[PDB]
UniProtKB/Swiss-Prot annotation:
Consequence the record notes for mutating D10A: Reduces affinity for ADP
Keyword ATP-binding appears in the UniProt entry: yes
One cellular-component annotation, GO: extracellular exosome
Organism: Homo sapiens
The protein's assembly and partners: Component of the CatSper complex. Identified in a IGF2BP1-dependent mRNP granule complex containing untranslated mRNAs. Interacts with CHCHD3, DNAJC7, IRAK1BP1, PPP5C and TSC2. Interacts with TERT; the interaction occurs in the absence of the RNA component, TERC, and dissociates once the TERT complex has formed. Interacts with TRIM5 (via B30.2/SPRY domain). Interacts with METTL21A. Interacts with DNAAF2. Interacts with PRKN. Interacts with FOXP3. Interacts with NOD2; the interaction enhances NOD2 stability. Interacts with DNAJC9 (via J domain).
Post-translational modification comment from the UniProt entry: In response to cellular stress, acetylated at Lys-77 by NA110 and then gradually deacetylated by HDAC4 at later stages. Acetylation enhances its chaperone activity and also determines whether it will function as a chaperone for protein refolding or degradation by controlling its binding to co-chaperones HOPX and STUB1. The acetylated form and the non-acetylated form bind to HOPX and STUB1 respectively. Acetylation also protects cells against various types of cellular stress.
Name used for this protein in its record: Heat shock 70 kDa protein 1A
Modification type N6-acetyllysine: residues: K77, K108, K246, K348
Residues of the full protein shown: 1 to 380 of 641
Modification N-acetylalanine occurs at: A2
Record-listed ATP binding positions: 12-15, 71, 202-204, 268-275, 339-342
Lineage of producing organism: Eukaryota, Metazoa, Chordata, Craniata, Vertebrata
UniProt-annotated stretches for the region Nucleotide-binding domain (NBD): 2-380
BP GO annotations: ATP metabolic process; cellular heat acclimation; cellular response to heat; cellular response to oxidative stress; cellular response to steroid hormone stimulus; cellular response to unfolded protein; chaperone cofactor-dependent protein refolding; chaperone-mediated protein complex assembly
Gene that this polypeptide is encoded by: HSPA1A
Expression induction or repression: By heat shock.
Amino acid sequence: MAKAAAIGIDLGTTYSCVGVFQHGKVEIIANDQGNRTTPSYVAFTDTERLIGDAAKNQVALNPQNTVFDAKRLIGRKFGDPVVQSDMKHWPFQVINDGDKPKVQVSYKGETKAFYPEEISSMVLTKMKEIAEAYLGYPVTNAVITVPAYFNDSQRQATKDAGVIAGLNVLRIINEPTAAAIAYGLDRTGKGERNVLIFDLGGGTFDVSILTIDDGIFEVKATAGDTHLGGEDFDNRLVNHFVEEFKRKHKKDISQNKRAVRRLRTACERAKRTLSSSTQASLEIDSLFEGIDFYTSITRARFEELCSDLFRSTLEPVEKALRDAKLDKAQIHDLVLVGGSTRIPKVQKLLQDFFNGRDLNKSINPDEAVAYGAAVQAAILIKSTR
Ligand SMILES: Nc1ncnc2c1nc(Cl)n2[C@@H]1O[C@H](CO)[C@@H](O)[C@H]1O
């Protein structure tokens, strides 16, 4: 029953996803709000602890006690230059506890401090409860994914987050490996298969090259930009609309925190519409000083606004190919991962770089990693019996 059941968890930097393989198919499990992905946010309030959508929804009201980006801290030392650099951009406090970072917050009127693995365990607990509500029984066996460049310390702290959450961690697998499993790329029989995984998420960009020789996976190269993602595209739309508001009304809105956040959430929504329509409308009632902001934007203007950012995704693709010592024609498969790969211009740039090649994109790119993890968790739990 429960002991023969296993889930697949994509524990992402900005969003997490949970899947289950049963009756010959993967089911990506929707949360209580009906969303197939859940924000990796934990809010500490005067009365409760919020996880996911509810935590993301009150981030503007409570920025000092809303934790996110815990994956950027997990398995790292406080003195690490990555930690020191990132700390300057977060609204929550990061403290040093014997060269280990802890996030310090106000919770139910008291000062509390948590290890990154304790924060990630709260996200994992929510993913586990989303699966339990769907299945009708508690599921404890799980496959948890990590980026291919995570070292032993980061992998061990992710497994510890799984233990704190009440999960029996069957295996910690690489995100690009879970994505290649989702597309059944390890079941093509004999001969080495070269796979490129193009992963463009909310806050990070990763390119991975794998060789699959008789079911065995090998990471040949990893490249990317840890500070490039969907949120940089939203911010480009934000700057455009701030300049448009200034031209129409001769008023600068940039200093009004509420106006910028309402514009930001509307921009993110409009960006998603632009992936399936050639125009999107913004409808913001009383944006600033009682002025409604009812406008539109073409996909052509959006592509111009982000042009340099889209083009920059091809430098790590080239870097990964040189590190892997492979030419373009030596890559058998191209796999898309991350919500931002739905952007038509991104797909066109990648397809043209690979000389008009077909892309593996039929599985929802923000769900492909959880999908593969769910497949692996089913195989692993069957072998355990
Ligand atoms: N339809 C879409 N068109 C463009 N961007 C999208 C889309 N869906 C998601 Cl999710 N994202 C973005 O992906 C990230 C999460 O993986 C977020 O930045 C989200 O906006």
